[PDB]
């Protein structure tokens, strides 16, 4: 059974802003982590699997990386659109787990 | 490509109902679909995978079914707490797609 650990638990910042936030699998997951995406209201929508495939559609903005247990979702760009709570998943095994989530707000 | 098909799309019931909701998937996924709830302003959460298995911790009275392209999940005693929308998910195949998710509501 795998825990995840997301940091940070919510952050505010500017429109235009670079925004990065960590995930942490208990144990080497490889590169079997999505993304998330939940906006206030909204249904749950994948942005990134394969720790770092960005999903067809989804903003350029977007990117991930790491591999093993230390991950990364990055926004190069804060946009008003982006206000809601990411969370990540490891899908190395079953069941599917999540972190915490991380509340996302522009200032 | 999979495509989730999810009926119905809302329904309202009472305390103590037997409830049903279906998901199709546009090909054969043998059972790798999950169930997901989420309450209003709560994160996502597990409920089943493996299309039958309930996750620890998860109440009794949630079960699926179904194997293929034809799924059900039951709630065999709606309760005050089930308000929320529920949404499957295949992961046969990535990137792991959404039905539409059903909206319950407790008359």
């Known amino acids: 059974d795998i825990q995840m650990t997301q940091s940070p ?3 505010s910042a500017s429109v235009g802003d670079r925004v990065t936030i960590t995930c942490q699998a208990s144990q080497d997951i490889n590169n079997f982590l999505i993304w ?3 906006k206030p209201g909204q249904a749950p929508k994948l942005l990134i699997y394969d720790a770092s495939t960005l999903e067809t559609g989804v903003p350029s903005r977007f990117s991930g990386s790491g591999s093993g247990t230390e991950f990364t979702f990055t926004i190069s760009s804060l946009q008003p659109e982006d206000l809601a709570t990411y969370h990540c998943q490891q899908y190395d095994n079953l069941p599917f787990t ?8 522009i200032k």
Chains 1, 2 share one sequence.
């Not at 999540?98 to 509340?103: D, E, P, V």
């Open 98 to 105: 999540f972190g915490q989530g991380t509340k996302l707000e």
């Open 9 to 11: 638990s919510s952050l």
């Open 36 to 38: 998330y995406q939940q």
